[PDB]
Amino acid sequence: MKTNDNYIEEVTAKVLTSGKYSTLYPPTVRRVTERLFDRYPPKQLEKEVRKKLHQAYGAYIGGIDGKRLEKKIEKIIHEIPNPTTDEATRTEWEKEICLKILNLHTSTNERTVAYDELYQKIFEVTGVPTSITDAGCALNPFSFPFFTEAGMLGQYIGFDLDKGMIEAIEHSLRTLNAPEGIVVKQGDILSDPSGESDLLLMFKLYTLLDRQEEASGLKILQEWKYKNAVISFPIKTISGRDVGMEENYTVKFENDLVGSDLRIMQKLKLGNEMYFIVSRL
Amino acid sequence: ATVNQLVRKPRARKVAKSNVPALEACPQKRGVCTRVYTTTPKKPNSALRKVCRVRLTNGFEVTSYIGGEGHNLQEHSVILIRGGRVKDLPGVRYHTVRGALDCSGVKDRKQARSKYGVKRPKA
RNA sequence: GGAGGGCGCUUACCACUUUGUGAUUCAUGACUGGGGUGAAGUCGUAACAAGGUAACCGUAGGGGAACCUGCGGUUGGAUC
């Protein structure tokens, strides 16, 4: 069966070997080719998988420039002294030393306007999850200072795919002295949403999973047996310009959300991010 | 071509393709509509046309055009479709007669009464 | 009584079938691709008419987007 089965790695290695497309975990890509086996012509398999690397799922190709991030980390952590008069004074210094690292791309940066008002307004409806997960943790792993400002102390483990960005932000465990009660591990969710947790932080999920297929969003929440979540999106409508082209991360919910165990709890729309609260029975 | 190049390959004329995809050697065609909705005509124009889809009997679903200051059609009724050429509506190349079959026509009209099935009032 | 005829009997081709096996063909199609037009992104700007701008052909490598780089070629050539 080499026609189809020895012709999956000839395709798959090529992506995961090239240093330009190597920003991914081996299992993540082992999945996305068995999915797309019968998707594009048998002489155009790797050829049109590059379409899912440029037209779709792109900018993660080449990656987020970790060799520009540490370039703005080593140039950042060595700027001001370390006033650590006590043990929570190592955190308040670690607070601003971390704040700017989520502010190179204008996405987790539109999230830093919610570091004081919307990192505790979420605990009133899920509890204080001590079994937690996270999808798309590109530049959102320093939310712990504010997640534990309320008392989230359980396992927060965000799963990104860019390894040149995850390892440019995972070295921080001791270099930056990030809290020692938190793990991080790689993983996608357009491929791997299986497990059980309590809170499912969806930050950069957006409609990138609804780009892998047309109308296939309600699948993941369920796969990861759960209770609640938090799901936000950009609301950068320029005085009635991005209307329609940006108001669909919602109307694909309320409409499709009649019939199963999924429900909704609350909804807001402030700053540049509109968070969703979800429920199941 | 030279004279010798004509005895081997003759002059291949065009296929004489008309502006309608199919006609079944028939001028008009009867169909049945499915949904009633309104779309947008083109960038310069700014009007609301009766762009309704009428499914035929040969398995073809072609969208025609319904003209008039107000028709009263029903989802499950016969609709006669004739020929026509319209540019302001992309994808549309057919019309719809009125005053015949299960379709009604306008009233209180004198000029251009030969179409839309208008009748002659007794003056 | 024979000749021979006829019925039966039976061999030949041969339509209808029937089991496998391919070609062409046909209608929907479970799994789908990209185009397409509606749309629509207060982008000249990561380079704010100074953070100092040729166009294209063939080919190869990088093609979140028209590109950009290597090699060779052409005039059909922003200020100049």
Place this chain on the structure above:
RNA sequence: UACCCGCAGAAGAAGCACCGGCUAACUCCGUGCCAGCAGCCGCGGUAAUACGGAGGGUGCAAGCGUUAAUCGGAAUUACUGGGCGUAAAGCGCACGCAGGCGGUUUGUUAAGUCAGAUGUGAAAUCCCCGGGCUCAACCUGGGAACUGCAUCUGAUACUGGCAAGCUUGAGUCUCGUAGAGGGGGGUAGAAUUCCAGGUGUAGCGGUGAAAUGCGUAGAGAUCUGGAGGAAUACCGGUGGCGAAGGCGGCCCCCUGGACGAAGACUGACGCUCAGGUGCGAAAGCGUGGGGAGCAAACAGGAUUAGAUACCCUGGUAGUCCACGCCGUAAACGAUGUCGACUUGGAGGUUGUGCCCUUGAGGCGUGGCUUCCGGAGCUAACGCGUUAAGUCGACCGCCUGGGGAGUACGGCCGCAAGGUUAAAACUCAAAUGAAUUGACGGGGGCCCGCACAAGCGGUGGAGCAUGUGGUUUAAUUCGAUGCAA
């Protein structure tokens, strides 16, 4: 029943389309990018001859519109009868079979062609001349036509076949000259860099600022010597050579094409082409080497709320070489080849002669190449004795702009891909050349405090209810560069 006669009686019998420019033929109201026509260009925001309605006019009539099919229009399928530099159009460039086509003198044959005759091409209809239903339509007599095909009988200008000759197109050969024409060996010099001595040590390379690399195990720079690899400066001009692509060091061997020139011989062995064969830069690939520089990916240093665009520092393929495959370009001279005809002048290169080469030149005879220009040709720019002019022979490509030089089905490959080559849909265009003008991160031309300069001011955290901030005891209010 046709036809004919009599009585009453203008009594029962005219609608529809169009009404901007095509394409003959208009006023107002309602509505105000809203509601509506539609074939093309389009029309519709308090004045619509483009909508609806009233009136009027025009077309036409027992019929007026719309729609569908074919043809003319459409020279928009060109044998009659158009192009191929720039609009969509000549294959990257040649050798050639089956085809097409092929000069001159004489003779034969009579297939093609031409003429005459016979047979035949059934009727209606088309065509011409007449008659008959009151007339017309319809029907009918006679004649003609059916462009075609075949047989017999003739003529012999051209074509073709057979036989016999000539030379004006010229093949080949003898005697010469010019060339980076192509390929296989060898040799020389300069320069970069690496590998060895002597001498000389915190600087070197490199970017308008910074840094990485390279250095105290002898860097950079300089001299000498050696190894390896690649390219041939000045000479070098759009010169020469080849069908095209392409190739510039002296230089050995092998060998091809083109051209000049006084004399012989052989007597159109001639032009062109599908399929096929061969050649075809660079890039890329397979099987083996070389590898000093440069240089696609990749990564160090800059840089910025992101330069894998450009700058700087290195390097794996590749470039080089032997043996193969693929056959892709602005492979452009945007021009297929061959032959013939055609007012001329002014610059190079390369042969053979005359003349006093005594003034190293005039006056003749060829090939190749550049520029200008008249007639003529073409929309225009231009070409214009190398044709894109005037004739002829042969072949290829293109029938609107996108989709698309794509997909599928064959062929050609170990790959990357190429060749032959669509059907739907979308749109009223698209593309070209000459103008008029705007404009340009404007310079050669050009006038003025155009920026100054030379006796002097305005510019005052006060105020003149005219006034550049807070003001509702400001707002019942003007006007915002002696260019609002």
Place this chain on the structure above:
RNA sequence: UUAGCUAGUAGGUGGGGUAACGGCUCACCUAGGCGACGAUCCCUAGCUGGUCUGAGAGGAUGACCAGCCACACUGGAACUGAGACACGGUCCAGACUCCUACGGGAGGCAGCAGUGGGGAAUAUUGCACAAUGGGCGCAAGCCUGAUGCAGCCAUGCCGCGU
């Protein structure tokens, strides 16, 4: 954008068959036949005398009149007969429509009317054998949805009237 097709296919002899010449049907022998002057296959379409468009050359079309071929529920095959492998003959297989006491049988409007369905659309379950034509008969006569007519729709041409 279908490149080779064909082993009773090509050719000679003999035998046999048909009203006649023939691999139409066999044996034997032979290795040829066709084909870029387009073999086969696929798709589509009746042809001709004409009509329509055009000044012609052409293109398109094949209805009505007429010549010829093919077909007769769907396949195959055969007999009677001078001429047919037979449209209202027959036998048989399959499908469909009926009858029946479950052994089973019969029939064909792609004839004129008419019905159901499909389709933007095309007729009356009519009259007469007077003439014409055909079959039978010595003649007379009869048969003849062929023909000759009527009714219906302005489909087209032409004329007249309002």
